[PDB]
Design a protein around this ligand. Structure first.
Ligand SMILES: *[C@@H]1O[C@H](CO)[C@@H](O[C@@H]2O[C@H](CO)[C@@H](O[C@@H]3O[C@H](CO[C@H]4O[C@H](CO)[C@@H](O)[C@H](O)[C@@H]4O)[C@@H](O)[C@H](O[C@H]4O[C@H](CO)[C@@H](O)[C@H](O)[C@@H]4O)[C@@H]3O)[C@H](O)[C@H]2NC(C)=O)[C@H](O)[C@H]1NC(C)=O
Lengths: 204, 201
């Protein structure tokens, strides 16, 4: 029978009131023979009725993919409410229930450090600006770079790594062309920061 | 029906002739009604006959788990040979085939850079020594720390991240509250598959 996956909102969306955080219930391997699928949504077990179901997509393996999207309130997500997606289909015996919520436990503020390229790296045409983000909890976080107020997007960021004290860390690497707008900033968004946002700059 | 999982050797094992790299074929959810399983192994499609298949193991959920281990030659793995486990069981319609190999592509040598703690971090009781390992391919790699020739184990390493040029990078962080610290990296594209970069204070 078909299978269900339930996805949390993107971290950046929960942390800024101007954005729209969402929970996404994805159904895979929906067949032509049994192609009707229903959705019930529950917030802390309380049925909700504001979910919107997206258009199914026939996949190259002759299966169907169905998606239901529920908008959540920023503070419901951040206060630890649970969201339950129930999927009904007559090919499945019982309805499938999946639940998700923010990780439990005391949020911890990230410390942000910018580290310049090793002197050795300059023997290459591009050097790496590093941003160490450590000690945060939970692991939901967003990291971006900018210079002179505009985004710098030639960066990659590691996933969060569980550290030995139960907090998380990550690094973000901005690749720059060695000439050094000599001022670069690492921007970090996390629920435990004041105004959910902080910047740490790097001279060159 | 039963399921097959095929595991590669540990990166360190392919890189040192003193270690013994192995490919491991694990079969789960074998039933009592049809519990005989046969393994056939192939290297680049040519059947090989030196795998060591262990005794089936009844699990607490009343399934059996059978595992077969094929020792591989270091240079076969690094030369990109494909290892195929074929698993036969009377409960299966057809035999299950799983194949594994080193990631395809031209190997690229890692650059290793050690970065000292931000001076700001010292206002806390523990500081982070950073080891940047970038530009490597494939992503199979080993990273370790030592000081004064002995292992240092208060470190964590990120998984490899695909960079924009198709190579990988990672960071490794050593937490210290031995003034010479070394980040050691093993990778197929390095000379003698090993390099070190040290950091004072
Ligand atoms: C027909 O083709 C489609 C499209 O390729 C296949 O759909 C994929 O099926 C696989 C497994 O059947 C799914 O793998 C799962 O991915 C999950 C997350 O990734 C998806 O969701 C996010 C949504 O934002 C995307 O960013 C991402 O790119 C993917 O779209 C994982 O969470 C799943 O993990 C679960 O199972 C593993 C089992 O080990 C556990 O470790 C986990 O805890 C968890 O239980 C899983 O890895 C994949 O998501 C499907 N893609 C889509 C788009 O739905 C069909 O499988 C294929 N049909 C066949 C082959 O018969």
């Amino acid at each position: 029978g078909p299978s269900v996956f339930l996805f949390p909102p993107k971290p950046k969306d929960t942390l800024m009131i101007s954005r729209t955080p969402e929970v996404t219930c994805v159904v895979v391997d929906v067949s032509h023979e049994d192609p009707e699928v229903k959705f019930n949504w529950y917030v802390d077990g309380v049925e909700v009725h504001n979910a919107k179901t997206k258009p199914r997509e026939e996949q190259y393996n002759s299966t169907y993919r169905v998606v239901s999207v529920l908008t959540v309130l920023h503070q419901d997500w951040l206060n630890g409410k649970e969201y339950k997606c129930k999927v009904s289909n007559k090919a499945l015996p019982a309805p499938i229930e999946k639940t998700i919520s923010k990780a439990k436990g005391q949020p911890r503020e990230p410390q942000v450090y910018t580290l310049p390229p090793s002197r050795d790296e300059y023997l290459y045409g591009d050097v790496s600006l590093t941003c160490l983000v450590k000690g945060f909890y939970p692991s939901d976080i967003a990291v971006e770079w900018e210079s002179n107020g505009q985004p710098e997007n030639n960066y990659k960021t590691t996933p969060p790594v569980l550290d030995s004290d139960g907090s998380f860390f990550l690094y973000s690497k901005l690749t720059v062309p060695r000439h050094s707008g000599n001022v670069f900033s690492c921007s970090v968004m996390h629920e435990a920061l004041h105004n959910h946002y902080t910047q740490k700059s790097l001279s060159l």
